[model samples]
Target: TLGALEFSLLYDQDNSNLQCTIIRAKGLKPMDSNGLADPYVKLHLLPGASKSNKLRTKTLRNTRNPVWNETLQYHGITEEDMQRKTLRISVCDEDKFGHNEFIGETRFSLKKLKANQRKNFNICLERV
Candidate 1:
């Protein structure tokens, strides 16, 4: 675990989608030689297995702390599949080469979240 993130969730059953906004991140550790890294996040919303898909944010260049303010949506999600979906997000360094470096990661079950709906909050980044 390295940094903290602010997140919020949305559901639009009419469209069969669930959305997550990566509102921002603060106090993230750098993964570069100069104590800075081009940071971005990857999102996975797995279905039935309760839901995850792979999506990503644009990289913020050369910063210890980054604000993504990015929203990722999971398609094909239904009310019946809601609680079972697992959400996985990983923060990483975007390298010039293909080998991007992993910074940290976190995951949770959708059923466990009851929104403040409008409130932004901090989530600890994790690593295995």
Candidate 2:
């Protein structure tokens, strides 16, 4: 079984969003002209317990080397609120025509910043 993986999180200040990328480090060959890989990724965000809350749950994207992001609104959420929230990221490998497999998960909290203060956060996954 192929078990290698690499991923990174980048906070985009210009867009006021958080983006994540997942790459298969091993077990699969590079993509072809169509840019399709054997394994794809599904990203999930686990917020607080509120089923009806749109911001509390979402499937950002489904793609190889996926870039998942969410924007903040003036009355919706500020940098301070995001800093106080705990976010969890789950990455899975779903082959083109097979059941999805769980690769791994990473959980972290955003650091608080003042209203006028700017900041960025990045995360890298490590083997246990």
Candidate 3:
């Protein structure tokens, strides 16, 4: 079954990293209709030039709760680069067979982060 997912990002000024989180209001039940589903989230930083140029990709903590958050260090990235970027959040299930099935996803622009301004920004993700 398909459900809605909410993603958010909390920026840390001192450490220069963005904390990412993904939440699903209605949890997922395994295809077998057993218990709770094992879900994992992946975040992709899309480049301003091309979609192939992904800056970074990360997997958030695996849990059933509607919220997941973690701090991501800005590696090899400067304030200038983040000013003109976007982010893509992909949520999926973790299975032993093979790559788990894709659940849901969302994307947004990173233009909110400006140079010389506050080093923190909060991003919220909702199903379209």
The model with the greatest TM-score is 1
Whole-model Cα lDDT per candidate?
A: 0.74, 0.43, 0.51
Q: How close is candidate 2 to the true structure, as a TM-score?
A: 0.42
Off by over 4 Å in 1: 32-36, 47-52, 114-119
My TM-score estimates for the predictions, one after another, are 0.80, 0.42, 0.56
Sort by TM-score, best first: what order? Answer: 1, 3, 2
Model with the higher TM-score, candidate 1 or 3: 1
In candidate 3, what are the lDDT values of residues 1-128, reduced to their tens digit? Answer: 35555545554545555555443424543343332256665667776355434332333333444444444344444455567566776556656564565666667666675433433333333445
**Regions of model 3 farther than 4 Å from truth:** 13-15, 22-25, 29-36, 48-69, 113-128
Please say which candidate is ahead in lDDT: 2 or 3.
3
- Clashing residue pairs in all predictions, respectively, total 13, 0, 1
Residue-level lDDT tens digits of model 1 in 1-128: 38887787777667777778887777777666643478888887765343235778888987767888888887787766667777778888877774578888878777765533333457888897
